[PDB]
Amino acid sequence: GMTVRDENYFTEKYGLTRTHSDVLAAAKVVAPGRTLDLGCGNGRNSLYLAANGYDVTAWDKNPASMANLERIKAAEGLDNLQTDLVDLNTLTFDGEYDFILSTVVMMFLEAQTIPGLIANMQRCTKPGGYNLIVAAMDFPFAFKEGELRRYYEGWDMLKYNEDVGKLRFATMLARKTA
Numbered sequence: 094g095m096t097v098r099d100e101n102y103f104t105e106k107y108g109l110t111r112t113h114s115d116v117l118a119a120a121k122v123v124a125p126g127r128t129l130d131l132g133c134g135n136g137r138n139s140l141y142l143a144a145n146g147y148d149v150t151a152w153d154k155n156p157a158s159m160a161n162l163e164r165i166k167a168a169e170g171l172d173n174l175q176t177d178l179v180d181l182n183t184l185t186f187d188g189e190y191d192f193i194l195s196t197v198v199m200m201f202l203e204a205q206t207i208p209g210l211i212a213n214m215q216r217c218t219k220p221g222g223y224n225l226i227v228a229a230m231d232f233p234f235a236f237k238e239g240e241l242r243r244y245y246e247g248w249d250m251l252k253y254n255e256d257v258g259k260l261r262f263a264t265m266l267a268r269k270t271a
């Protein structure tokens with residue numbers, strides 16, 4: 094009968110790279126809610142979240158990839174998954190989200206984009222909301238030791254790892270104060 098639409102369901106059915114392990118772990122602590130996948134890539138994370146109760150908005154560049162996600166979305170009947178084409182280097186957005194995630198996307202953005210993009214994620218997060226960031230540390234951009242954490246001064250620093258994953262990645266789960 095039941096085949097639950099978890100990370101293994103999506104890899105078996107569509108053959109995309111597996112849902113990020115930090116998105117899987119975050120989902121155990123972040124209650125389903127209004128979620129922005131900011132730089133959704135192939136939609137691996139957006140598909141998982143939308144199939145598991147989150148109301149997802151998935152944005153990235155690449156018209157082909159976004160159309161591919163939209164086609165899988167339609168096959169999976171995920172009416173709670175909205176997709177749009179964006180350029181993260183020029184995007185300014187509005188909105189109020191329970192959860193914003195950015196996983197392995199910033200390293201491909203211009204270094205000058207990052208401060209404004211993080212400011213934008215922060216102001217569009219509801220009080221008590223969560224931001225998840227997974228990002229390379231030290232081609233066009235990489236965070237320096239402690240930098241991701243400094244951007245999030247004043248938020249509850251729930252989880253923050255700077256560990257190998259051949260590149261070091263900073264993984265952060267922060268919650269906005271209420």
Ligand SMILES: [Cl-]
Binds near residue numbers: 196199201227228229
């Ligand atoms: Cl990154």
